[PDB]
Structure 1
Amino acid sequence: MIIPVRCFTCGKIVGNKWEAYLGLLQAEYTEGDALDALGLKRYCCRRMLLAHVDLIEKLLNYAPLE
């Protein structure tokens, strides 16, 4: 549903980097340079933001009220 707080393999906090990653991709960044800028060096941590699919945006379309 939502970006994991930590990389499964490493333990590095990647929960505060999904929105920043989306912003850097809002810029004309190539998909790898965004990860490089976010300080993600290991490929295990890079896969966290590469492969993540944000479904919580789709689940929030089902408003309980309003």
Structure 2
Amino acid sequence: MIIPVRCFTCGKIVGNKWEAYLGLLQAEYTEGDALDALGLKRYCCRRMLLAHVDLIEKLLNYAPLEK
């Protein structure tokens, strides 16, 4: 759903990398260059950022229960 906080394998913080990763993709970076620029060297952290599906942005399109 939302970007995890730690990498499941090693434990590196990735929760603060999602927005930067998207900003780089919109900045015409390749997924590899972006993951390197963010400092994600292990392929486990690269897996975390490269395989994530941000569904929360679509769950926020539904009106809430309380206004």
Alignment: residue pair count: 66
In structure 2, the gaps of 5 or more residues are none
The 1-side partners of 2:45 and 2:34 are apart by 13
TM-score between both structures, scaled by the size of structure 2: 0.93
The 2-side partners of 1:51 and 1:27 are apart by 19
Sequence identity percentage = 100
Shift of 1:31: 1.1
Shift of 1:30: 1.0
- Report the counterpart of residue 47 of structure 1 in structure 2: 47
Cα root mean square deviation, aligned: 1.4
In structure 1, the gaps of 5 or more residues are none
